[PDB]
Write a protein that binds this ligand. Structure first.
Ligand SMILES: *[C@@H]1O[C@H](CO)[C@@H](O)[C@H](O)[C@H]1NC(C)=O
Lengths: 48, 25
């Protein structure tokens, strides 16, 4: 019924009704950083 | 080096690279 990765984490699951298997990919995430020169030069910023 | 490395003679770089070669939740 389940699939697991080497890290013992759930990877794939089988549909109980139509017995098909679906991959489980987690939703995206990540850090946010702010780019800026000195405040004494401008107040513009760019984010990554 | 060789720009596209098209020569039959492989640089030591490729050998070392291949020798070293050989989550979102
Ligand atoms: C910015 O410049 C002003 C004067 O031009 C000065 O008083 C202030 O200390 C400066 N601050 C920084 C962080 O450079």
């Amino acid at each position: 019924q389940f699939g697991r990765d080497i890290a013992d984490t759930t990877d794939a699951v089988r549909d109980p009704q139509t017995l098909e298997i679906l991959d489980i990919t987690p939703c995206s995430f990540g850090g946010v950083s702010v780019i800026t020169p000195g405040t004494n030069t401008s107040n513009q910023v760019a984010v990554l | 080096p060789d720009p596209s490395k098209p020569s039959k003679r492989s640089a030591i770089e490729d050998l070392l690279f291949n020798k070293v070669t050989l989550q979102k939740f």
